[PDB]
Structures are given as structure tokens and as C-alpha cells.
């Protein structure tokens, strides 16, 4: 997250921190995700496509810090790693959506707590009007030039951009589809960045906090005329329902 503010997991208790174990024991951070039901985390396919083996991955819930434990956190193995079969990429990733069925060593799913809660899915094709302010959350870079990720969770606010504005040649042209949502700061001063992928774009829709988007792609970060691009969750409900059933 470029700009924005530090936070803790209490302010985004559906946030899932996803890590990969390397040949040799090393564990590195992969991406964010969102808890949509006790046993199911939703994320982005691009996060996993090069390493599709479920056994590689560790998922935490209730975690506010990148490389230290948060009191009350839960740790999970990935029982099933489901990638979208129509995924494609040339930068602008299509169908960038993934599901992780989580299961602890004791064979259990998420248990809701002050730090662990689910986020509601939107109604189909029901998104906020463009210009609406939404929030994004993640452990990604604080500056495009940084080498390190922040140790503390961050969040910021971005505004939704019309498909018409985003499809302009001087924005993204035809790289952006109707199954994607653009969002940016009016001054281009805050944005998602590398490491924020897979995490939640949450909007308040009819008084309900709703998982409107999943961090997907962008050209650089916090750059003029280059919004963040998010998978439009409201266009994937049958896919989600079928694969979680």
C-alpha cells in the first residue's frame, strides 16, 4: 500500500495472509486474500499460477504483522487450491480469481473471533457508483522502489473509476474489461502495490461491507493515469458458488 495508514487485523478481520514454503524450509509472503466463509479464502490466480501445488502454502487469519505472530491468530494448510481455468495474462490478467480451502493441522476451519470474521459477497452485477470511496488492505510495498514489505498491515482509500474513463487510451485502453474494476486516488498519491495482490477492495453497499474487488494488476503504483485494477467479484458469483459448494 502506497500512502494510506497502518492498521491491525481488527479493522479488516477477513484479511488472510498467504505464504509459501520453499524447498529448503524458507517461508516467504505471497499475497493477501479474504475469508468469505469459515473454510474458504478468496484471492487472485496470478499469485499461485507458477506454483499451483497446494502443499506449498500456509494461510494465516487474525494476523496483523508480516513476520511475527499476532496474538489469537490461526494457521492453516491449504486443503485445495482452485485457480480459474480461464485465467490469462499479458499484464492485464483476465479472470484473476482463486479459492483456497483452508484446514488447520487439527482438521478445522476458521473460528470467528474479534480478529477473524467473514466478509460478505456482493449481489450479482451490483457494484457501487463510480466515484464511491472504498478501502484496500495489504502487506505490499509502501514505495514502488522499496525492496522490503512493511512489517505492519496497511490500508488506504481509493475511488472507483468508470469503465469509460479506465478504457481511455491514456489510462489502460483495452487492457481493462467489464470483469475488472479500476480504482485510484484523485491525486494519484495512494494505491495498491506489489504484494497487495489477492487482497480485498471493500465498499459499503446498502449499509453492508462488501467484497467488491480483489487486487489484481496495475502499471507501477500510485502513477498518474494508471489506476489499480481489481477483479470485479460481482461478475464471478456462479464460479464462486460452484467451486465452494
Amino acid at each position: 500500500i502506497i500512502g494510506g495508514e497502518f492498521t491491525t487485523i481488527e479493522n479488516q478481520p477477513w484479511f488472510a495472509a498467504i505464504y509459501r514454503r520453499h524447498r529448503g524450509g524458507s517461508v516467504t509472503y505471497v499475497c493477501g486474500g479474504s475469508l468469505i466463509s469459515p473454510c474458504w479464502v478468496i484471492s487472485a490466480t496470478h499469485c499461485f499460477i507458477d506454483y499451483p501445488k497446494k502443499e506449498d502454502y500456509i494461510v494465516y487469519l487474525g494476523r496483523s504483522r508480516l513476520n511475527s505472530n499476532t496474538q489469537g491468530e490461526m494457521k492453516f494448510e491449504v486443503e485445495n487450491l482452485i485457480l480459474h481455468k480461464d485465467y490469462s495474462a499479458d499484464l492485464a490478467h483476465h479472470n484473476d480469481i482463486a479459492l483456497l480451502k483452508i484446514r488447520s493441522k487439527e482438521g478445522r476451519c476458521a473460528q470467528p473471533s474479534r480478529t477473524i470474521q467473514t466478509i460478505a459477497l456482493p449481489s450479482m452485477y451490483n457494484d457501487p457508483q463510480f466515484g464511491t470511496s472504498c478501502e484496500i488492505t495489504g502487506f505490499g510495498k509502501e514505495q514502488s522502489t522499496d525492496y522490503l514489505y512493511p512489517e505492519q498491515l496497511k490500508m488506504t482509500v481509493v475511488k472507483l473509476i468508470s469503465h469509460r474513463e479506465c478504457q481511455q487510451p491514456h489510462y489502460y485502453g483495452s487492457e481493462v474489461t467489464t470483469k475488472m474494476l479500476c480504482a485510484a486516488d484523485p491525486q494519484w498519491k495512494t494505491d495498491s502495490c506489489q504484494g497487495d495482490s489477492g487482497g480485498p477492495l471493500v465498499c459499503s453497499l446498502q449499509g453492508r461491507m462488501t467484497l467488491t474487488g480483489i487486487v489484481s494488476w496495475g502499471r507501477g503504483c500510485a502513477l498518474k493515469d494508471k489506476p489499480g485494477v481489481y477483479t470485479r467479484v460481482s461478475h464471478f458469483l456462479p464460479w464462486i458458488r460452484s467451486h465452494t459448494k
Binding site: H46, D50, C193, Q194, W217, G218, C221
Partner: peptide, 12 residues
């Protein structure tokens, strides 16, 4: 490779 889309990739 230094931004969103190529996280956890073998090229990067």
C-alpha cells in the same frame, strides 16, 4: 516484476 501481477512468479 516489481509491481502487481507478477507476485510469486518464477521469472521474477
Amino acid at each position: 516484476c516489481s509491481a502487481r501481477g507478477l507476485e510469486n512468479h518464477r521469472m521474477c
